[PDB]
Amino acid sequence: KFPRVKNWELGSITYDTLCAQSQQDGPCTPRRCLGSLVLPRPAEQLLSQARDFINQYYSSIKRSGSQAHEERLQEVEAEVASTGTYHLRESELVFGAKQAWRNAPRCVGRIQWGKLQVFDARDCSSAQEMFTYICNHIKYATNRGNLRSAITVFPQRAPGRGDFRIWNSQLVRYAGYRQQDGSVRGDPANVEITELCIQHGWTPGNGRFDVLPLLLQAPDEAPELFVLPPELVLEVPLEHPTLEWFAALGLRWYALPAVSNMLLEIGGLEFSAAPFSGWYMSTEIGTRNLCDPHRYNILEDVAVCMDLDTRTTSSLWKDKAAVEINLAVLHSFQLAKVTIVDHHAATVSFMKHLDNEQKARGGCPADWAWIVPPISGSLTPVFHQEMVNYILSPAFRYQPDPW
Amino acid sequence: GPKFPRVKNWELGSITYDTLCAQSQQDGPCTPRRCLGSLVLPPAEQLLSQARDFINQYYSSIKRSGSQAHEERLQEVEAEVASTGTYHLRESELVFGAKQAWRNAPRCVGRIQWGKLQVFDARDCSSAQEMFTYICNHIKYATNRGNLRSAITVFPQRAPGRGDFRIWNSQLVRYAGYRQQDGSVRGDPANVEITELCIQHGWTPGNGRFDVLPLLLQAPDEAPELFVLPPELVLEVPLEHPTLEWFAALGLRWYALPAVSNMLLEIGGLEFSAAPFSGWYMSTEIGTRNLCDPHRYNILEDVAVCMDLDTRTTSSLWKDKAAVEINLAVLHSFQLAKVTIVDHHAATVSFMKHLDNEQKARGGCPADWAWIVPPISGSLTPVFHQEMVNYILSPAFRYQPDPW
Ligand code: HEM
Ligand code: HEM
Ligand SMILES: Nc1ccc2ccc(CNCCCc3cccnc3)cc2n1
Ligand SMILES: Nc1ccc2ccc(CNCCCc3cccnc3)cc2n1
Ligand SMILES: C[C@H](O)[C@H](O)[C@H]1CNc2nc(N)[nH]c(=O)c2N1
Ligand SMILES: C[C@H](O)[C@H](O)[C@H]1CNc2nc(N)[nH]c(=O)c2N1
Ligand SMILES: [Zn+2]
């Protein structure tokens, strides 16, 4: 019934009762746990999801049962009955975006969940208008390096009509150019999107950090290509605090992590284009983006620069190089005065989050495998904390690639 | 396509399906509504079906499934359970079961070695004194002057209306944990209760950080008896660092042999409450968990201060730097001492090979991602990028309540 949740560093026990509010199935069954899989394998449906969200919204503003509540419930009921769908008021939408972030089991930055700038872009009719919105989002969120969490929401999906979509997975992404000799110049995670941009008329560069154009799509139209003004895109050159040779590597990363391919679901309504951004945790760049074998894969180069023994795993050359790389990222962002958080500070704030949420809602959906950082796992408090995972709505979801 | 879990590796792009999970007979803690995969500890009718299942497994592994000897063994087990309420395994059945339990263990990253396990039959054991003799033999054989060899020793099974054989200690080798007057702990905080239990049973305690605990051994329906291990039997490795010359002066050490002793070995519904087993260490167990956990030796700050690191701020990555060097010291010293050890890279690489062997051999491999991924350098090792399916196969090692 209710999960017993234990922290093994401190011996404390909580009991998750929030999970009882879950209405969507995850991938596990009693026969087998599939919690490490990255991706998932009528009018009353909409109406119940809508009622529940409205009920959540009016509860949040401490006005459940009131005249405005009862009335809003009928507007919704009448609109669905007549049209098969309905629309959110902006304030509701602001509440919904905030709750979807709050409910995101894989996010370690949820201490911040109540501080989210919400742009209503539901009055958008063309890819061109999507671009103006995206450009303003970037300017707002970047804020000269004093980063601010933000989401822009484009029109919801509608029965028998194509979706608004941003084709890129993030608003800022480095091109990955496939060389005929097997290798890849740039970011190999972005080969396919780079090729789509080229096919749709983009003239390609040939560096390792070429900022890609955005491919934007309004419903049932071919996507259009837009180059971001280079001044909107704040980047941080990487240097190391004591290893002067490091800056010679020419490494750099962009300040703004702005994710553009997820679908935002609120009250049964689906927003297929709703880019959001906050700020980086240093390991995203330092460990995953730069050291993952299927990414920039710079572990060996840095190791040689440090003059370690590559011939054997037991010299822990990989661990040593990785730590300096992460250190280069933290030092550099702090130097360039751009918001960033290290994995220790982040995980410590997440524990406080678990505690606030335990008192606020009786629990907190969390995916242990995603919350635990990719280096120095057990050196962080979250490693030793048991977590319960489940789907609450509003929620961010994955969705198929539009091509 | 197929109606079995699809399993992806995100580094390589490769896909497999787990058909093996279809053989699973026991429910884990998850449901469609919530995943509980990160929690550490979540009648003759019943017996016979488990026994029938294991016998089928056994004859399958020797390629005699459906044969005359298969059906006779089944009938023999049905009859034995019919007259005594339990039954007994043949020696080769015990050997197969023990190995299958290790093979089936989802949290073990060392399973590439599973077919190479020396099985010591000790189902003839009738006293605590004899358990000790058995245990000492195990330690000597397994330690092998540093060229470690996997082994398990199996004492008699749970009997209806009879007390269990139990080893009270969680390992055969454990450092004492002395609760101090000032509230703190000397030695290993993990071992406070077993330490106090030993003293309550007449052990005279030391006062070191690294006092080897006596064994508390229990034959059926008798009070546990106390046995001190002769020190030459317990191989230890003093820790030093290959370049940081001061590390040796910390006086840190660890023992060679990880020999877990509080787990229950289940085979065909039979329960072996006392069946200590041992392999060799992955270096992160000592370097990261035992030495760096807040609630264990907690030496991160000491080492960092010695390395002259800025421990006032998280962003200096002083915890990460110190952790690495500690782990490096564990590896270096074990190698120098010529004691078997595997680093977290070599271990995880070998586990990927195991997943590929078991894909071909059994159509999958139950695996607990949170335990398979090492506690430092996670995404630096290949298993991080590998999806895994977790489920309970039998024969199995299970946790069991503490005897007191
Ligand atoms: C403000 C500081 C933030 C920090 C430090 C942070 C940190 C992180 C990290 C490290 C991850 C793991 C991502 C990965 O490994 O690819 C993540 C995931 C995620 N974040 Fe946050 N995040 C922040 C803001 C936000 C905001 C503003 C939103 C939405 C409004 C959000 C929603 C999500 C979601 C839905 C995931 C799961 C992504 C997926 O499953 O692919 N986060 N976050
Ligand atoms: C041969 C070298 C071996 C290595 C390197 C190895 C490695 C490991 C590691 C690192 C763990 C994680 C334990 C923890 O973090 O507390 C583990 C767990 C485990 N191992 Fe292995 N292991 C080996 C041999 C064995 C053997 C011989 C057996 C039994 C016959 C075995 C059965 C288990 C079981 C049941 C677990 C899960 C323990 C638990 O859940 O508490 N292992 N192994
Ligand atoms: N700092 C932040 C904040 C929020 C983030 C949200 C998402 C992401 C990246 N999402 C995971 C991408 C991996 C993937 C690949 C294929 C299919 N699904 C997911 C980073 C964030 N960083
Ligand atoms: N190298 C090896 C080989 C086999 C091992 C088997 C078990 C263990 C430790 N088991 C986990 C103990 C921690 C714990 C505490 C409380 C409740 N559950 C588990 C190590 C092995 N190492
Ligand atoms: C297979 C495994 O679930 C997958 O590689 C996950 C593990 N944990 C992760 N955690 C984070 N933060 N990001 C990731 O991409 C992943 N990948
Ligand atoms: C809460 C969490 O499950 C717990 O800290 C686990 C995580 N993974 C682990 N992995 C291993 N190998 N050993 C452990 O003790 C643990 N502890
Ligand atoms: Zn699960």
mmCIF file of N, CA and C in Angstrom, chain A residues 1-7 13-22 26-28 33 35 102-107 110 350 353-354 357-358 361-371 382 384-392, chain B residues 29-40 42:
data_model
loop_
_atom_site.group_PDB
_atom_site.id
_atom_site.type_symbol
_atom_site.label_atom_id
_atom_site.label_comp_id
_atom_site.label_asym_id
_atom_site.label_seq_id
_atom_site.Cartn_x
_atom_site.Cartn_y
_atom_site.Cartn_z
ATOM 1 N N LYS A 1 0.833 -1.199 0.000
ATOM 2 C CA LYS A 1 0.000 0.000 0.000
ATOM 3 C C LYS A 1 0.871 1.253 0.000
ATOM 4 N N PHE A 2 1.373 1.639 1.166
ATOM 5 C CA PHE A 2 2.257 2.797 1.249
ATOM 6 C C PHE A 2 3.705 2.376 1.504
ATOM 7 N N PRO A 3 4.579 2.654 0.533
ATOM 8 C CA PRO A 3 6.029 2.431 0.564
ATOM 9 C C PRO A 3 6.736 2.974 1.804
ATOM 10 N N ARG A 4 7.545 2.119 2.419
ATOM 11 C CA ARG A 4 8.454 2.515 3.476
ATOM 12 C C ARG A 4 9.755 2.986 2.825
ATOM 13 N N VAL A 5 10.121 4.247 3.039
ATOM 14 C CA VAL A 5 11.284 4.844 2.379
ATOM 15 C C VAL A 5 12.399 5.191 3.378
ATOM 16 N N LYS A 6 13.580 4.600 3.204
ATOM 17 C CA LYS A 6 14.636 4.747 4.205
ATOM 18 C C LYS A 6 15.902 5.433 3.699
ATOM 19 N N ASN A 7 16.465 6.318 4.522
ATOM 20 C CA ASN A 7 17.796 6.858 4.264
ATOM 21 C C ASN A 7 18.835 6.070 5.064
ATOM 22 N N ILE A 13 13.262 7.179 8.408
ATOM 23 C CA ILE A 13 12.211 6.554 7.617
ATOM 24 C C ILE A 13 11.057 7.530 7.324
ATOM 25 N N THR A 14 10.671 7.626 6.052
ATOM 26 C CA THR A 14 9.426 8.285 5.687
ATOM 27 C C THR A 14 8.484 7.275 5.019
ATOM 28 N N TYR A 15 7.263 7.711 4.732
ATOM 29 C CA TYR A 15 6.270 6.861 4.106
ATOM 30 C C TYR A 15 5.617 7.660 3.009
ATOM 31 N N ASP A 16 5.793 7.210 1.772
ATOM 32 C CA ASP A 16 5.214 7.910 0.639
ATOM 33 C C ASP A 16 3.739 7.548 0.503
ATOM 34 N N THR A 17 2.887 8.566 0.561
ATOM 35 C CA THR A 17 1.452 8.389 0.370
ATOM 36 C C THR A 17 0.969 9.208 -0.834
ATOM 37 N N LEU A 18 1.860 10.041 -1.371
ATOM 38 C CA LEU A 18 1.562 10.816 -2.562
ATOM 39 C C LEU A 18 1.366 9.907 -3.776
ATOM 40 N N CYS A 19 2.062 8.767 -3.789
ATOM 41 C CA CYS A 19 1.994 7.814 -4.908
ATOM 42 C C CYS A 19 0.564 7.343 -5.181
ATOM 43 N N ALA A 20 -0.248 7.292 -4.127
ATOM 44 C CA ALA A 20 -1.674 6.995 -4.238
ATOM 45 C C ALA A 20 -2.410 7.910 -5.227
ATOM 46 N N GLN A 21 -1.855 9.094 -5.491
ATOM 47 C CA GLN A 21 -2.483 10.037 -6.419
ATOM 48 C C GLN A 21 -2.125 9.754 -7.879
ATOM 49 N N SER A 22 -1.245 8.782 -8.121
ATOM 50 C CA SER A 22 -0.817 8.442 -9.485
ATOM 51 C C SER A 22 -1.930 7.797 -10.319
ATOM 52 N N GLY A 26 3.560 3.132 -14.902
ATOM 53 C CA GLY A 26 4.959 3.092 -15.288
ATOM 54 C C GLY A 26 5.254 1.725 -15.888
ATOM 55 N N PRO A 27 6.540 1.454 -16.189
ATOM 56 C CA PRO A 27 6.950 0.253 -16.943
ATOM 57 C C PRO A 27 7.119 -1.024 -16.110
ATOM 58 N N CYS A 28 7.009 -0.929 -14.792
ATOM 59 C CA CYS A 28 7.260 -2.089 -13.933
ATOM 60 C C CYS A 28 5.994 -2.904 -13.628
ATOM 61 N N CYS A 33 11.161 -5.467 -12.654
ATOM 62 C CA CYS A 33 11.376 -4.037 -12.591
ATOM 63 C C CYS A 33 12.109 -3.571 -13.850
ATOM 64 N N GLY A 35 12.832 -0.164 -14.264
ATOM 65 C CA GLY A 35 13.061 1.228 -13.898
ATOM 66 C C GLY A 35 14.277 1.900 -14.520
ATOM 67 N N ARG A 102 7.724 20.276 -10.968
ATOM 68 C CA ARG A 102 7.707 19.711 -9.628
ATOM 69 C C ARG A 102 7.544 18.196 -9.626
ATOM 70 N N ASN A 103 6.789 17.693 -10.591
ATOM 71 C CA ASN A 103 6.457 16.285 -10.637
ATOM 72 C C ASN A 103 7.464 15.458 -11.418
ATOM 73 N N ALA A 104 8.510 16.099 -11.943
ATOM 74 C CA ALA A 104 9.468 15.428 -12.823
ATOM 75 C C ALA A 104 10.506 14.595 -12.059
ATOM 76 N N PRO A 105 10.302 13.276 -12.008
ATOM 77 C CA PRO A 105 11.088 12.371 -11.163
ATOM 78 C C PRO A 105 12.589 12.412 -11.434
ATOM 79 N N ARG A 106 12.970 12.712 -12.666
ATOM 80 C CA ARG A 106 14.375 12.701 -13.057
ATOM 81 C C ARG A 106 15.134 14.004 -12.802
ATOM 82 N N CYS A 107 14.427 15.035 -12.350
ATOM 83 C CA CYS A 107 15.062 16.346 -12.181
ATOM 84 C C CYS A 107 15.582 16.561 -10.763
ATOM 85 N N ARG A 110 14.720 20.493 -8.561
ATOM 86 C CA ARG A 110 13.327 20.846 -8.260
ATOM 87 C C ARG A 110 13.131 21.688 -6.991
ATOM 88 N N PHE A 350 18.597 18.922 -3.228
ATOM 89 C CA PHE A 350 17.528 17.974 -3.514
ATOM 90 C C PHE A 350 17.009 17.267 -2.250
ATOM 91 N N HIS A 353 14.765 19.464 -0.697
ATOM 92 C CA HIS A 353 13.532 19.365 -1.493
ATOM 93 C C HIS A 353 12.664 18.176 -1.066
ATOM 94 N N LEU A 354 13.276 16.994 -0.952
ATOM 95 C CA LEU A 354 12.583 15.797 -0.476
ATOM 96 C C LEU A 354 11.897 16.065 0.853
ATOM 97 N N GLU A 357 8.921 18.505 0.327
ATOM 98 C CA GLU A 357 7.861 17.789 -0.374
ATOM 99 C C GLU A 357 7.200 16.760 0.523
ATOM 100 N N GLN A 358 8.001 16.098 1.362
ATOM 101 C CA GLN A 358 7.450 15.137 2.315
ATOM 102 C C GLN A 358 6.404 15.791 3.225
ATOM 103 N N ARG A 361 3.309 17.370 0.427
ATOM 104 C CA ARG A 361 2.444 16.447 -0.322
ATOM 105 C C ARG A 361 2.464 15.002 0.180
ATOM 106 N N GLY A 362 3.301 14.707 1.170
ATOM 107 C CA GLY A 362 3.389 13.351 1.681
ATOM 108 C C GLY A 362 4.333 12.454 0.888
ATOM 109 N N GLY A 363 5.174 13.063 0.054
ATOM 110 C CA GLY A 363 6.147 12.315 -0.710
ATOM 111 C C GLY A 363 6.669 13.090 -1.899
ATOM 112 N N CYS A 364 7.466 12.421 -2.721
ATOM 113 C CA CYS A 364 8.021 13.056 -3.902
ATOM 114 C C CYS A 364 8.514 12.019 -4.907
ATOM 115 N N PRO A 365 7.910 11.982 -6.105
ATOM 116 C CA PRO A 365 8.382 11.058 -7.155
ATOM 117 C C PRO A 365 9.833 11.343 -7.545
ATOM 118 N N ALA A 366 10.688 10.329 -7.491
ATOM 119 C CA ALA A 366 12.099 10.521 -7.818
ATOM 120 C C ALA A 366 12.691 9.258 -8.448
ATOM 121 N N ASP A 367 13.480 9.442 -9.508
ATOM 122 C CA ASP A 367 14.118 8.338 -10.224
ATOM 123 C C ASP A 367 15.574 8.307 -9.792
ATOM 124 N N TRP A 368 15.883 7.349 -8.917
ATOM 125 C CA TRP A 368 17.181 7.266 -8.265
ATOM 126 C C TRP A 368 18.329 7.280 -9.274
ATOM 127 N N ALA A 369 18.148 6.565 -10.378
ATOM 128 C CA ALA A 369 19.225 6.379 -11.347
ATOM 129 C C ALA A 369 19.566 7.669 -12.068
ATOM 130 N N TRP A 370 18.603 8.590 -12.115
ATOM 131 C CA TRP A 370 18.807 9.896 -12.755
ATOM 132 C C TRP A 370 19.235 10.984 -11.766
ATOM 133 N N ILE A 371 18.717 10.905 -10.542
ATOM 134 C CA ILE A 371 19.087 11.835 -9.492
ATOM 135 C C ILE A 371 20.551 11.682 -9.024
ATOM 136 N N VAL A 382 22.231 11.780 -1.902
ATOM 137 C CA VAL A 382 21.129 11.132 -2.610
ATOM 138 C C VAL A 382 21.370 9.642 -2.871
ATOM 139 N N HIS A 384 22.411 7.417 -0.922
ATOM 140 C CA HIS A 384 22.017 6.638 0.256
ATOM 141 C C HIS A 384 20.538 6.774 0.618
ATOM 142 N N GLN A 385 19.805 7.533 -0.195
ATOM 143 C CA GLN A 385 18.388 7.806 0.035
ATOM 144 C C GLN A 385 17.495 6.926 -0.849
ATOM 145 N N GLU A 386 16.635 6.099 -0.249
ATOM 146 C CA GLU A 386 15.670 5.343 -1.050
ATOM 147 C C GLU A 386 14.646 6.295 -1.683
ATOM 148 N N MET A 387 14.190 5.954 -2.881
ATOM 149 C CA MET A 387 13.249 6.808 -3.605
ATOM 150 C C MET A 387 12.149 5.977 -4.255
ATOM 151 N N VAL A 388 10.972 6.586 -4.362
ATOM 152 C CA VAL A 388 9.798 5.967 -4.948
ATOM 153 C C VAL A 388 9.545 6.693 -6.270
ATOM 154 N N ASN A 389 9.240 5.939 -7.315
ATOM 155 C CA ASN A 389 9.061 6.537 -8.630
ATOM 156 C C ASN A 389 7.676 6.307 -9.204
ATOM 157 N N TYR A 390 7.043 7.381 -9.674
ATOM 158 C CA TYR A 390 5.695 7.275 -10.237
ATOM 159 C C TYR A 390 5.327 8.499 -11.047
ATOM 160 N N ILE A 391 4.245 8.401 -11.812
ATOM 161 C CA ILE A 391 3.868 9.487 -12.715
ATOM 162 C C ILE A 391 2.713 10.303 -12.161
ATOM 163 N N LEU A 392 2.981 11.581 -11.904
ATOM 164 C CA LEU A 392 1.942 12.522 -11.513
ATOM 165 C C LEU A 392 1.645 13.418 -12.710
ATOM 166 N N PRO B 29 9.199 -6.029 -5.681
ATOM 167 C CA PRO B 29 8.426 -4.981 -4.994
ATOM 168 C C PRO B 29 7.708 -3.960 -5.909
ATOM 169 N N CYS B 30 7.895 -4.030 -7.225
ATOM 170 C CA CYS B 30 7.300 -3.028 -8.117
ATOM 171 C C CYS B 30 5.880 -3.367 -8.585
ATOM 172 N N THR B 31 5.146 -2.331 -8.989
ATOM 173 C CA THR B 31 3.822 -2.471 -9.606
ATOM 174 C C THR B 31 3.717 -1.418 -10.713
ATOM 175 N N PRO B 32 2.744 -1.571 -11.636
ATOM 176 C CA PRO B 32 2.488 -0.505 -12.621
ATOM 177 C C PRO B 32 2.358 0.913 -12.033
ATOM 178 N N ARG B 33 1.866 1.041 -10.799
ATOM 179 C CA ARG B 33 1.639 2.360 -10.183
ATOM 180 C C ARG B 33 2.908 3.023 -9.651
ATOM 181 N N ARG B 34 3.833 2.226 -9.111
ATOM 182 C CA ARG B 34 5.089 2.785 -8.603
ATOM 183 C C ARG B 34 6.295 1.830 -8.645
ATOM 184 N N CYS B 35 7.437 2.377 -9.058
ATOM 185 C CA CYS B 35 8.686 1.627 -9.049
ATOM 186 C C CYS B 35 9.424 1.788 -7.705
ATOM 187 N N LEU B 36 9.720 0.642 -7.094
ATOM 188 C CA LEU B 36 10.401 0.570 -5.809
ATOM 189 C C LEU B 36 11.767 -0.101 -5.968
ATOM 190 N N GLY B 37 12.349 0.031 -7.158
ATOM 191 C CA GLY B 37 13.568 -0.676 -7.504
ATOM 192 C C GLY B 37 14.822 -0.201 -6.803
ATOM 193 N N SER B 38 14.713 0.908 -6.077
ATOM 194 C CA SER B 38 15.869 1.483 -5.398
ATOM 195 C C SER B 38 15.851 1.211 -3.901
ATOM 196 N N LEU B 39 14.874 0.442 -3.432
ATOM 197 C CA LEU B 39 14.844 0.078 -2.018
ATOM 198 C C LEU B 39 15.805 -1.089 -1.776
ATOM 199 N N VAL B 40 16.613 -0.974 -0.723
ATOM 200 C CA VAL B 40 17.616 -1.985 -0.394
ATOM 201 C C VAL B 40 17.008 -3.319 0.059
ATOM 202 N N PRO B 42 13.235 -4.603 0.323
ATOM 203 C CA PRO B 42 11.805 -4.313 0.159
ATOM 204 C C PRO B 42 10.918 -5.382 0.796
#
